[PDB]
Amino acid sequence: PTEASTQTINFDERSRWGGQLKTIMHTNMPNVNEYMFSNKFKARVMVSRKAPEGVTVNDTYDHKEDILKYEWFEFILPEGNFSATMTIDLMNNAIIDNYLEIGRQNGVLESDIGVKFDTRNFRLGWDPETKLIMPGVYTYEAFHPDIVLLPGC
Amino acid sequence: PVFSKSFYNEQAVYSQQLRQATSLTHVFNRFPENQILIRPPAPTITTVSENVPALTDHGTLPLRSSIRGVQRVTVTDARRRTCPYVYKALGIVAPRVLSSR
């Protein structure tokens, strides 16, 4: 190759020209690679829960509802290429995969996760008069990805 | 770039009985007995609107002899307007000669 490098393919002249470049190429791109940023993402969850220093009874159900804390997080995914959903739950795991780490240890309840990607038409089972969902279920049907949130997060 | 792909909804109505039971609700299908009002049978073949990308050669066209460094491109929809479902549109154009003065 090296010595060949020196020698010249010599297209001539007294008339310049050009070339028709056709080209073949293949790639193996994992849908959730990091280099294409199908890996990261920010979002803030609940990280603290208490009340200001006196534990129970009159506010034993109400003390729990008095101090909340939020913080921004860049959490990541394991590279690969996953089904429409798979991806979702992967975050909807790694979003929990943060909670478990900081939520339990600081009074945060599963109740108040606060960030949940999910496909579904909560409200589909609605009704006008009750102004609620008559089957007692957010009718478990796939519609299109969606992000459910709690206050602040 | 909006076309239709089709599949085989499994055993048609058998896909439907694992859908009146997996949905947990008879949300649409409020009446699972009034022959008339029953969540219509699912068809043997389901169809899905899906969009592919479209690579197209439009032909060759005359151009002004002077192009401002900032060309503006616009994809207009039939009733002539902006379609915001447009994702990424890259046009490339190789100039070429014809005629002469």
Binding site: D127, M134 | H26, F31, P32
Partner: peptide
């Protein structure tokens, strides 16, 4: 009328 016959899920 709630229009949803309850207990009809198999």
């Amino acid at each position: 009328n709630p229009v949803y016959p309850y207990d009809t899920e198999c």
